[PDB]
Amino acid sequence: MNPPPPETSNPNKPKRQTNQLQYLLRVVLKTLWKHQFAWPFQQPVDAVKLNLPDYYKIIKTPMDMGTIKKRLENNYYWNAQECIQDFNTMFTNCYIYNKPGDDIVLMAEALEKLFLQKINELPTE
Ligand SMILES: CC(=O)c1c(C)[nH]c(-c2nc3cc(N4CCN(C)CC4)ccc3[nH]2)c1C
């Protein structure tokens, strides 16, 4: 069964737009989105659809790139590090829920490498 998805707006949280956050949307996210292994990560895990009734019994800080995309579009983040932490949560959830060698984990590892490659150098202020 499904909990509510992570919030993509929060009127009590301050917003910010920075060159690094613009980069994270326009280049990092939008490039990862097009990768052949991106599709498991483009939306929150639907435990009912996927017949994974235990997913949210294990994963208590769920995150996906669709949520991150909407957060970036809504200037939800204060800085790039906050956004990068959401990516890191998404990858780590996949490693927690699954086990090494699983097909989904191979997909997450490949995307994580590409993600790190792209955030190695960010624009300046
Ligand atoms: C448990 C785990 O780590 C995991 C993650 C992070 N994701 C998925 C997953 N995500 C999916 C997305 C689809 N879709 C098919 C339809 N298409 C248009 C887009 C949506 C189908 C099956 C999926 N399985 C699993 C099993």
Q: List the determination method.
A: X-ray
How many whole angstroms separate alpha carbon 8 and alpha carbon 68? 8
Is residue 90 within 8 Å of residue 41, measured between CB atoms? yes
| C-alpha to C-alpha distances, 54 to 6, 58, 96, nearest whole angstrom | 18, 6, 13
Cβ(45) – ligand 1 distance below 6 Å: yes
114 close to ligand 1 (CB < 6 Angstrom): no
CB 122 within 8 A of CB 80: yes
- Does the beta carbon of 22 lie inside 6 Å of ligand 1? no
**What resolution (Å)?**
1.5
Secondary structure of residue 34 in the 3-state scheme: coil
Q: Is 59 in the pocket of ligand 1 (CB under 6 A)?
A: no
Whether 85 contacts 68, CB under 8 Å: no
Q: How far apart are the CA of 35 and the centre of ligand 1, in A?
A: 14
User: CA dist 122 to 11, 54, 101, 116, Å?
Assistant: 28, 37, 31, 11
- How far apart CA 77 and CA 21 sit, in angstroms, is 8
Q: Is the CB of 97 under 6 A from ligand 1?
A: yes
